[PDB]
Amino acid sequence: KSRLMGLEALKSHIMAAKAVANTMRTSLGPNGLDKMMVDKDGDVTVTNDGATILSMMDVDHQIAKLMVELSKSQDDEIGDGTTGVVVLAGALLEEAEQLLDRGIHPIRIADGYEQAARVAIEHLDKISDSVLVDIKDTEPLIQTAKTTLGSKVVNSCHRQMAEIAVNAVLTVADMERRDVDFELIKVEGKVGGRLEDTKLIKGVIVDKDFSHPQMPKKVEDAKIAILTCPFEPPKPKTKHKLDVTSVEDYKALQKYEKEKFEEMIQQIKETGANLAICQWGFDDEANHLLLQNNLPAVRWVGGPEIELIAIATGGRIVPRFSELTAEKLGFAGLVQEISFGTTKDKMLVIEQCKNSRAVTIFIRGGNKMIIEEAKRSLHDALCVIRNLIRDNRVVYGGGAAEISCALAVSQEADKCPTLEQYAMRAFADALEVIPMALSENSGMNPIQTMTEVRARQVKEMNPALGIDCLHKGTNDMKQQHVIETLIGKKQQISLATQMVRMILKIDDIRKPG
Amino acid sequence: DRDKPAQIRFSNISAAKAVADAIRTSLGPKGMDKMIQDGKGDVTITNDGATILKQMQVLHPAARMLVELSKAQDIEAGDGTTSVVIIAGSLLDSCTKLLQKGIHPTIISESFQKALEKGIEILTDMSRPVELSDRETLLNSATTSLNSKVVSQYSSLLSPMSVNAVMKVIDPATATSVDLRDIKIVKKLGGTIDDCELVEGLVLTQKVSNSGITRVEKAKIGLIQFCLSAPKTDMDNQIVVSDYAQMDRVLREERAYILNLVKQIKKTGCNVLLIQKSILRDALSDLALHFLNKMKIMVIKDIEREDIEFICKTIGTKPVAHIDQFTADMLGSAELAEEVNLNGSGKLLKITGCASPGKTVTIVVRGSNKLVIEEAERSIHDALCVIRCLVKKRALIAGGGAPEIELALRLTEYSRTLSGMESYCVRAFADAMEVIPSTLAENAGLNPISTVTELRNRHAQGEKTAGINVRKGGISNILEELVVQPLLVSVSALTLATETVRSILKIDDVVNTR
Amino acid sequence: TDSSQGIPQLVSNISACQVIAEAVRTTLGPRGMDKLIVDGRGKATISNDGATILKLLDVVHPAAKTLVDIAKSQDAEVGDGTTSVTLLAAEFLKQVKPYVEEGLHPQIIIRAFRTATQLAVNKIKEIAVTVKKADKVEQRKLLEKCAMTALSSKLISQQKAFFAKMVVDAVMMLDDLLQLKMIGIKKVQGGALEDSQLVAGVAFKKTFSYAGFEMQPKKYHNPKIALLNVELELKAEKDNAEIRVHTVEDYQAIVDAEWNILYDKLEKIHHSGAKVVLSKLPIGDVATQYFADRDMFCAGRVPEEDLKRTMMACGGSIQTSVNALSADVLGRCQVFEETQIGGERYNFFTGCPKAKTCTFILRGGAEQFMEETERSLHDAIMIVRRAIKNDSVVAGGGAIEMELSKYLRDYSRTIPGKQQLLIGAYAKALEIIPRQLCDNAGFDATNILNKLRARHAQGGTWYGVDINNEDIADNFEAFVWEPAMVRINALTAASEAACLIVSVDETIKNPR
């Protein structure tokens, strides 16, 4: 095993980084082609995600593992945009290896990129807008939803799900001192109806998964009840079976269970209880008998789900079975069964709560890819509305911000000791790769369009000119209602700079050769 | 198709880059030496680029084109015949990366032409004009541009010859000069080099004869060009020679044969004869010379073709040939001749040439040990060359790397201001102008990148600041050092380099042969 | 199948030592390069310290093994000077290599090296200047200048430097050692309103909350941490065991039979006085309710470092029994507070009878600022400890090697023997610190060594080297110093290693 001494290790690392970034450079923008993925079995899927593809990627390099780890660790604050950072890092590494061939230490360019990103952020902070009120975030809601979603899962537009997701965040933002929590909103998915049947569960919705839909089931309840005492023969987290060396003990236990059913129904009828949910259960035979004899009630409520049952009512619990009354329970409002299919199981939706801590959305589908794309669009909308309510500052997209930053870097670079201008010119030219790739992904020439838009931006003012991927009329940005958050761009730039610095810092020798 | 022309262009670019890189460490006064080895084993130490370019041999279209370009640059201007190769190499290296992306050569050629025109106009608008209608300003410009070519003692030694050659005021400040049309600087061995003076008419160095008095005035030149050789025999001996008979025949053929021709030729006035070089004559009959000793004898040998061309142009006559000639168009001018030595060895005759339509005057230089004569010849050659270069125009500028950085910054700002896809190609020119200052800083012994960055910062701040010094070894202003150069040596060089680049870029396709 | 003895053996030893010398060289200055090391398991680690690299590498060479053993012993006995000694030994070997093949007996250079080392030690002892409570009036100016020197190493904020000075001055009570490996430090995660906070006691991390967690009092008058290795979780206790399944009365009977013993055990362990249960395993669902019904405290999921810090601060005893305990192996606190900041719940154990550890919370509300900017504070507190404990000090940097080299070169011109060239080579080999320091920063050492030699030719001050301004300034005014006791030990160790290397002439192998 020989040791890589000299400049071959850096060249190999840059080549590996470029070969890795070439995979993400092809799929860029909404006009990207569907990328396929197949595992060991015969499961072949198609999608376009910068995080799903990088997760199931197999590499044989030490730098690729750190790269994909840094790419996956930063995705909760930007949402959509984990593909351009790789291309930016690849272009920066290519410029670094091009400028290093003349005999320049990587420390100089690594320190210059810091001030380059600093001045880029300083220039981007002054070119934005701050005139958003209670109308600028409510009237263009349909335009923002159309720009976020697009036309990938459904050709027509969708206004119900967008308004539902907006209200689900508006009912929690201003209520908890302009703050929102990720654990408060949940995403649920189940096949059934169509995509337009979007429901907003104000309370909590719980499924039961029945076994036989032909069993007579009639709804007739009006008050919920929570208990901790064993309402029925419980299961102490142990798979019970025929562990009795007798034959009459089975009939004895059946008679005892019938007597217990009779006693329980007489107590809930003499005190005023109804659907009492505990934290234990039994087999399916007991539930079948309880549904066949009289009174509809289904057990099987084991697990942490009882926690939500301790929060969707309003009160406390009982430590002993011999401590029950008409005031220690909890009153309800409308607790019944809901089943839109009328052929499957039932669902319970709590419509009585003093706070909003489990608001969720319910979207029906018909396959596996459409529901996944719908949930991805919903997550992206939630992320963008969180970024909007966190800071009322946005910026125009398309590809004008990169050109403006490059122009500002090229302009504010008159004085230079011996490396400042070199670093600023090696960092500015690497920013014009995103619009070039976006224009090359379509059926137009990227070089000519980029030169034309740069000339148009440098001739007159109003830096709001870019390219169009939908083939429309003019190349304006304020007319297509396209917008992009600035915090996400700042985070992406910071992550790219940190990754470039970490790559340019660790490059000495390697132990396994 | 497309692969074959691309491979042909790549091979041509690689060959041109190899030719340009074969010699590069020789620009500036602190250049490196090179020992060229001959085919027989002899080695020669040299440092000039033109000698290495004209000595080596290689078969290639790009190499031959570069050699022709260097020869044309040396013939036209005469100075800086090594920077054009580096400029062409940088332009080809830029065109390589320009074509690697996917740009048509027409747009690249148009951008190169526009950049060349812009640079030429900037160089013409930046340079300052001077005056030369009088003699004081001309002498000042001469003594300011002459004290920066060689060392101090050589300059002080050539200053008398320089001020003697610059005194030739013939053209009344015209557009072009004729310094290469009527100049014939001769060389003479023996004596002191201090005895030099401008001489008109004609200067010779062959003895006429060795008789009595030879101080006459009969045209002083024999306009004759017919054959004077003896009729050769068909073989060695036509018959058997022993006693008489055959001896009397050859005696009469040697004595009473050519004498009749001499008599029939001497019947015309002005008995002045001569002959060319004795490269084809075996031996001349001395009997004819003894018979010609009477009635005035005058003969001058050792005459080349250039001497005949100079005599036929200074006096203003045309030579005649053939034997059947009964005209009278062979006379010249009679004034004074018969000169002696100037207190030393070596025969040399001079004629001032009074009342002549041609006012051609030359400089008769001398020397000793063949060590200070060729040096003075090269010195006066460079002197009259730079004098003609300065009198061709009026613009001048200083060198060191400042104009290159200025032109690079101007081209960068023009590509940033001008719109269009061709601007990128113009940017390539902005990356093909900072090679001379970097090479100078590398040959001096300092950091080239830091010096280039400092020069660029100074040019962006205070416009015209300083450049690169060689004697002191730092960054000092050029206004104190007496060193300048005409604007033509840069404009013509840039135009020739751009033309050569366009010619080598427009040629492609396949290279068929016989 | 070939082997020799003498010159070839020494040449092979020098060539083997050069490999381990060139393996670690760039990691010397403050901004050295990083190195990624991975073994056959599949986990890689990035490190830049020379000791960590030398500890995770083994050489099958006797000379290299002895060298790394001497380096490890020096690092364990002192704590600074691991790569410098190796570089000095490598330079000495490289300088002595050409003076061996010319037919020279190495038994005459050991005396010259010993005399040179003794002269250097004497010069350092006669040139060292110590200052400790003799000027600068009251100690207020002394501590002010100490804090200024601590904040002069890295350009940081003023509040951070003040907090670092407070946390380094509020821990000097019973500590009488020469290293900070006793109290230690711990970096926390999260965010707060301020930039940094200080407290005296044991800290904690995020704790999982359940239903009804506010039943316990937030403030305790006299809490007692229960040091019990057993836990009260659903997996530990049980409500139904191996019993005959017939009806529901047997379940109640067995659960009462178990609850009797459970209540007996809990009342026996609570009658001793302990009430703050710190269970290692996380709590369940009914255990919290049972603890809140008895007006007690419950916890779960705690690391071992926090338990060790609590045992060291509060003075707890190691208990190896569950039941049959006494009231003397228990801990006693004073103030136990629970304050939530942001999205986490923080704990404060203030009032320990043994002031040992203190928590320096550094939370700014980020994810990258916690890991980064962590070596500057460590270097600052190390410099503070070295300036407080040690008395002798001298100007750091490359201002002490050039003077010694010049003195040795001037003294070597007054000896008429074969030791002249030896002392000259020893003085020339001493120039390896500033050249490497300039090469590691990406500068030109050739343009600085000449200026340093010109300045030290007749001055003899404390003019070292610079990094930021890239020039030559006085190191005595830059507020950078070093103890005058570590350099002597490092030079002695290097001389001993060189003597041990040059003393070995051959080796002896044995198959069986």
Ligand SMILES: Nc1ncnc2c1ncn2[C@@H]1O[C@H](COP(=O)(O)OP(=O)(O)O)[C@@H](O)[C@H]1O
């Ligand atoms: N006195 C001087 N000071 C600074 N630079 C000089 C000086 N003399 C010549 N040079 C530089 O040397 C270069 C020409 O060197 P060289 O190739 O040897 O002469 P030539 O070009 O006439 O063959 C010019 O570009 C000029 O800038």
